[PDB]
Subunit: 116 residues, 3 copies
């Protein structure tokens, strides 16, 4: 027999005739397509590990950038949440001229009015 | 060592005998890019098999409650979005906007008020 | 003994009495709850693999959409970064009337003035 230790847990004894099972945990209980870790096998019995095309988490952190249930947040910077967009006391650039009533307007549009 | 079996998500067992080799592999997300294995599997000391994410992960969707990342961009369900076709402010105000300067910068209320003072 | 080959690495030899350890790597050295890959065991000793509820990476790529240390970027399109927001040379829609000095203004508010002046 050999022993399999997962992180800090007590060893699993693997005897002759024993079965070891690997399981991708389902994020959503009825949904076999909801396993965040996708474990499959190859033609030569290779055990293959990947991510699901769709991953379900509570939070993604990449430096100051956060994705979570509240929205898209840059620590100390802009954000987008259910209550709307905060531009972080910075300019918003690359804005095409607004057309509909609830489109944003840009500097060029303010200037047009200023000359009429 | 005794002969044992490995069952992966209820696949038919893989029988492992004395003399057998078992391979674990991280799948490449991008066909020809060796650096694109989302699951980073390595070996260290003391027969440790170490599992982590790649520094760069490649997926089609991230779901974190009502916040969604996808090939179209960044969406809050029932809220604003920033997607390929543009920003949708979600029928909410946009706050914290510094004064626009270039012709394609957004303007703020302070600037609209400056104009009101200038025209008539 | 049997051998374990992980990707292109040298084989590990597993004899009778050997131990193999599976470990989640900590994303942050001081945080034992920062292991991106969550490995646990079930009530019949199944080895269960999942993601941490909180994952820490340098970049997520979903097609043109990127999450990274600079912020939220659509390649060739809109972005929201440490330096502010770019609207992608497209219109911004769904903007409620600005109120406070640093709120954005919409077409309706520009027209309201035009009708007064």
């Amino acid at each position: 027999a050999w022993k399999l230790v997962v992180n800090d847990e007590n060893p699993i004894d693997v005897n002759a005739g024993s079965t070891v099972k690997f399981v991708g945990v389902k994020a959503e209980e009825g949904n076999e397509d909801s396993k965040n870790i996708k474990i499959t096998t190859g033609n030569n019995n290779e055990v293959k590990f990947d991510l699901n095309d769709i991953i379900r988490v509570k939070r993604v952190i990449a430096g100051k950038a956060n994705v979570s249930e509240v929205g898209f947040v840059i620590t100390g910077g802009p954000n987008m949440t259910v209550g709307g967009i905060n531009a972080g006391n910075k300019k918003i650039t690359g804005v095409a001229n607004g057309i509909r009533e609830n489109d944003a307007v840009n500097v060029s549009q303010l200037n047009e009015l200023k000359n009429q």
